Design a protein around this ligand. Structure first.
Ligand SMILES: COCCOC(=O)C1=C(C)NC(C)=C(C(=O)OC(C)C)[C@H]1c1cccc([N+](=O)[O-])c1
Ligand SMILES: [Ca+2]
Ligand SMILES: [Ca+2]
Lengths: 219, 219, 219, 219
């Protein structure tokens, strides 16, 4: 029984089938975007969705019987679990958002194709080295976001009225997004010396990123 | 017949004649852009076109006889075939997009010069190693265009009205084009939490891009 | 039992005491941004800031006693003195900019945690190898800013009327921020050839920046 | 007189002296940017400019005698020659673009200082390596520019009415500057399929750009 189940879930037919179902669901979720299609052929999909969600639900249960505690030492499987989880909460209730969170289950195609799994892992493996530059930068943002609120948040509350608001504008500036005509020239019309805050800020923020890239390559 | 024609195609005069013609057709094509020129000389160059494409048609036929089945195993020759045949489609009124695709024949400069082919081939060469990331990106992109159409498409039809639209808008944001004042600040006036979609989205698309380039460097 | 004090300053508890203070003071200045907070607890929060500022002043005196002249060849300590000093001038009749400057002491978190210290040390270390190119470029901007003031400052004073203005603007075009529809297309309405100035400038400035990054990594 | 003169121009006193004239003129030329200064100090420095041009002219004449055939095979001196020639153009002639071009002479500071020379020399050495790509890139822009004018020029003449405009605009899209909301989206109000030109256009130009840099690094 234990061996009989185990032999099913690991077969090359179970995985091709589920993957096939993933590929199919993802095609329907695209289709669900057309309100035309919804009108003429969407009660079909509402049930198709619940059919696919169960087969996947079974898959998760089976894999937990087979792998037992080692299922939950698999970051990919926890992900699989958690992704199917949020897809279990009802259409109604909570908030409209959980309904939209359901689309995250297409990320199972990543979980289930070894080629996707390898790219993702390789990418993740870049992260641990960065946790030093990241923390410093987050602090850097925090201090400046504070200076930006007090300086500019009274006359420019949309941009700087709040720490959070100061954080959003500074990120925007960081991505260098319409930073001059859109933010600093207006600021400079009240506060002519605002360029002393943002030009240095940009240097730092551009230096750190470049140097972040050097160290990635070398490491 | 065989050896006489075969002797003309491989000649240094042949390829030189063709190449020189490409440069001429290219100077000439810049001229068909000014309708000042077109009212005073257009008949001269509309047929200069016509005789160039005749020569190219002939040359293509000859190279096929000389190279037989090995012609269509040659990517550059394959290219010339398609790049010439297109320019053979009638200017006649039924479908006038094809008229503009004719300028692509200037890409034969690439085909016929060995220093450029090196570059192109070199460029394409980095692609097969990237295909996995292309897929991953597109799967990421696809999930998010879905999320965007259902989240923002109601109140902001232009930007998220349609899966295709959200794809478009999302492409812009990765490129970092007028993304904040131009898209999410408006989004945030109706939906204050849009930054929880687009700010992670920005970290991700950027993370992958950088790592892709590093992947390019190392590979 | 001569120095007596020296044994306390060098201890694990002293340092951990300052870091715990900064992070509290760092958390405090955040909450000082909430306008609601400054009503409910504004008086409470002023007492905490003043204690810490005293403690820190004490902490600086002790470190001077111990290190003597070796304190003032430590950039990190030099930074600590002037940053603590800043937060101490009277709010009275001065410049009210100094009230905002006192957030700079949150950069002491960097100064007192060697990991951050090493990051800041690593970053600075890319600067001396770069100083040459910084000098060429600064020389490049300075020369073109002059050119831009003379060429476009009559009819476009907001952007180029003054040398600093030509600098700020020129810097913006360099960051490529909103430069065609935002700067050059306007200019070009009065002065049709302005692309011969700005387009080359962009090539140059981007080429250098790109080769600068390249030259650092390879070497 | 020649051999006697040659002993003069190679001395360390000489180089630093002409360098000192550059830096002084470089300072004064900054000053010529101010309306105020020019009002109450203009003739002192209008005079001082003519002196320097003469000295540089004499300096150029001397070095010719010293170097003979070699002078006109020195890249740094050819620059030196012509940028002095510009300043030798008379204060008039109806093309005051040249009056502005005077400040091109401050670049002699680059030719006269070997570390500057070294950076410039280092930078240029990158270029012959890229001549294949620039030709390729310029060929690519040339082709798509043609397509633009015939595709979008009649309804959008400012942006695409003509080759240069298409060139300009295309150059603009390649710096990714306001490309979407500013150019492609408007186009789409009238030409719904414009994303098929510009999005491929962007991918390719980045690809070539990115890959170019990677080639430089490894080599
Ligand atoms: C004619 O009188 C004004 C001259 O002032 C300047 O040349 C500046 C120098 C000296 N230092 C910098 C760093 C500046 C500068 O412009 O730097 C930018 C690159 C950040 C400018 C400046 C000085 C005051 C105000 C502005 N402004 O509002 O554009 C610009
Ligand atoms: Ca912009
Ligand atoms: Ca932009």
């Amino acid at each position: 029984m234990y061996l009989r189940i185990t032999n099913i879930v690991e077969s090359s037919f179970f995985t091709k089938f589920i993957i096939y179902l993933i590929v199919l669901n993802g095609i329907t979720m695209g289709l669900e975007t057309s309100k035309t299609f919804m009108q003429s052929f969407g009660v079909y999909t509402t049930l198709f969705n619940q059919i696919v969600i169960t087969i996947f639900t079974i898959e998760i249960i089976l894999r937990i019987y087979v792998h037992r505690i080692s299922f939950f030492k698999d970051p990919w499987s926890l992900f699989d679990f958690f992704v199917v989880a949020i897809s279990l909460v009802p259409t109604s209730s909570g908030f409209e958002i959980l309904r939209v969170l359901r689309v995250l289950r297409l990320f199972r195609l990543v979980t289930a194709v070894p080629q996707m799994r390898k790219i993702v892992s390789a990418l993740i493996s870049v992260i641990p080295g960065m946790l030093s530059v990241i923390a410093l930068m987050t602090l850097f943002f925090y201090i400046f976001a504070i200076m930006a609120t007090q300086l500019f948040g009274e006359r420019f509350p949309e941009w700087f009225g709040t720490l959070g608001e100061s954080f959003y504008t500074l990120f925007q500036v960081m991505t260098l997004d319409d930073w001059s005509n859109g933010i600093v020239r207006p600021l400079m019309e009240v506060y002519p010396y605002a360029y002393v805050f943002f030009i240095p800020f940009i240097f730092v923020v551009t230096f750190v990123m470049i140097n972040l890239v050097v160290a990635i390559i070398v490491d």
